[PDB]
């Protein structure tokens, strides 16, 4: 199914927003309830930077590598969780502060694996 459908269907439970970002920084799709800086986000991933800022909220990067990004706002405003779709795009999700970023990562990685086949 479509890019919008795969990324959009992730918005359930603890996951509140999603964005699919090419390795260039180009946003292929993002849910309409937010607006991510794609170049900033992809550089945090690529360069393993210590924080990611989305819409004025600083999320401290607590785990980052070729396949995963976990960042948490220390003040309690939530998490950013990223997985990679076959080295072609970064799929990120906003996760509610009470949600576990680990289980969110499992779901986001599953969707990233599906996205890889249509990119």
């Amino acid at each position: 199914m479509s890019l919008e459908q795969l990324a959009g269907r992730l918005i359930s439970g603890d996951i509140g927003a999603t964005a699919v970002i090419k390795m260039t920084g180009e946003i292929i799709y993002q849910s309409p309830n937010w607006s991510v800086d794609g170049v900033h986000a992809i550089n945090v991933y690529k360069n393993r930077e210590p924080s990611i800022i989305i819409q004025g909220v600083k999320y401290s990067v607590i785990d980052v590598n070729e396949d995963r990004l976990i960042a948490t706002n220390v003040g309690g405003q939530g998490h950013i969780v990223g997985a990679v779709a076959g080295g072609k795009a970064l799929l990120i999700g906003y996760v509610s502060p009470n949600g576990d970023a680990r289980t969110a990562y499992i779901q986001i990685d599953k969707t990233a694996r599906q996205l890889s086949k249509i990119l």
Binding site: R48, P50, S51, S60, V61, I62, D63, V64, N65, D67, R68, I70, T72, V74, G75, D100, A101, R102, T103, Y105, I106, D109
Partner: protein
């Protein structure tokens, strides 16, 4: 139950093994493999006989003994397989193919080692499910929290591990190859100054016992040295296996002082107090307060009387003047890694994170990187 999850915590010196949901490990035994002497290199000779743990030590006169884990890292995989086989069949008496198995690892364990553990568990032992966790992360969890900085010190390695929500923080982990075995060796050395002659492997084991029974960390080292010089108040008697008694004085506190002054054994590293501070400073500015407030000690080499109070003093001197600092030193801390594993493996919300055999079959050994973080 027929299929209860297993918890194995593999250390440089000791294996701690048992069943998820138990309060303590059922089996604690030395992480050693003994193979017949002079048969390691011999014409037409295979490696058919081997012994593990306490049996290897009992037969030391006919075996060459080796430690498969060095400074917390698996370095001899053939012998490590023997440790695991012994754990399942001889210590726990289970069929590994019938039990999910949670294992532990050092922080910064290389990718190849993580994959090899996973491969061995699925392909050799045919476990139905597996998980691996960082030792310090388990100890922290055992203390009832997921944010803090762990001082983990065992037989082979010491780490400072700052952790936030169960994640060991990027760039901030410190490894120091100074731990219990080095402290035993140092105690043998300084007892020579008193006119004793501890040298052999058997004598090393006696000194390990002296260390565990009589050593402590001085609150102020120079003051303690002055007390030991002026009087006999700190001196203690120790009875050797043959019945002879010796006296130990300032060696009681000079031995573990090495943790705070690694120069005692010619190491250039700063002491564990300073490496704690340095680790905290490599973490996000907004996380540091919570790390200072949650210093957790784990491992056998954190058992010295006085160590928590010494750490409180030393960290207070390094930290900002108003910083709230707390050292948590659980009485159970020689087994807190294992206990953390037991609690985690029994937790309802953890069960989804087991790596299943099916997942291993689909993804291969790198499945460990997908699920164990």
């Amino acid at each position: 139950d027929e299929t209860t999850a297993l918890v194995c915590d593999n250390g440089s010196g000791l294996v701690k093994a048992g069943f998820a949901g138990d309060d303590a490990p059922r089996a604690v035994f030395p992480s050693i493999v003994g193979r017949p002497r002079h048969q390691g290199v011999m014409v037409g000779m295979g490696q058919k006989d081997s012994y593990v743990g306490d049996e290897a030590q009992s037969k030391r006169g006919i075996l060459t003994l080796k430690y498969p884990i060095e400074h917390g890292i698996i370095t001899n995989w053939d012998d490590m397989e023997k440790i695991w086989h012994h754990t399942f069949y001889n210590e726990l008496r289970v069929a590994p193919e019938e039990h999910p198995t949670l294992l532990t690892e050092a922080p910064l364990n290389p990718k190849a080692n993580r994959e090899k553990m996973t491969q061995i568990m699925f392909e050799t032992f045919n476990v139905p499910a597996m998980y691996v966790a960082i030792q310090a992360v388990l100890s922290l969890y055992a203390s009832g929290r997921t944010t803090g900085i762990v001082l983990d010190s065992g037989d082979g390695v010491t780490h400072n591990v700052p952790i936030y929500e169960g994640y060991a923080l990027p760039h901030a982990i410190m490894r120091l190859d100074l731990a219990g075995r080095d402290l035993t060796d140092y105690l043998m050395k300084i007892l020579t100054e008193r006119g004793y002659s501890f040298v052999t492997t058997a004598e090393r084991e006696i000194v390990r016992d002296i260390k565990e029974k009589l050593c402590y960390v001085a609150l102020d080292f120079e003051n303690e040295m002055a007390t030991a010089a002026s009087s006999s108040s700190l001196e203690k008697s120790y009875e050797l296996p043959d019945g002879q008694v010796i006296t130990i004085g300032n060696e009681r506190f000079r031995c573990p002082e090495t943790l705070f002054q690694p120069s005692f054994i010619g190491m250039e590293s700063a002491g564990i107090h300073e490496t704690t501070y340095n680790s905290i400073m490599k973490c996000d500015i907004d996380i540091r307060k919570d790390l200072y407030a949650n210093n957790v000690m784990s491992g056998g080499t954190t058992m010295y009387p006085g160590i928590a109070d010494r750490m409180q003093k030393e960290i207070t001197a390094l930290a900002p003047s108003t910083m709230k600092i707390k050292i948590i030193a659980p009485p159970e801390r020689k087994y807190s890694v294992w206990i953390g594993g037991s609690i985690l493996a029994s937790l309802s919300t953890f069960q989804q994170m087991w790596i299943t055999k099916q997942e291993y079959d689909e993804a291969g050994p790198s499945i460990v990187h997908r699920k164990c973080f």
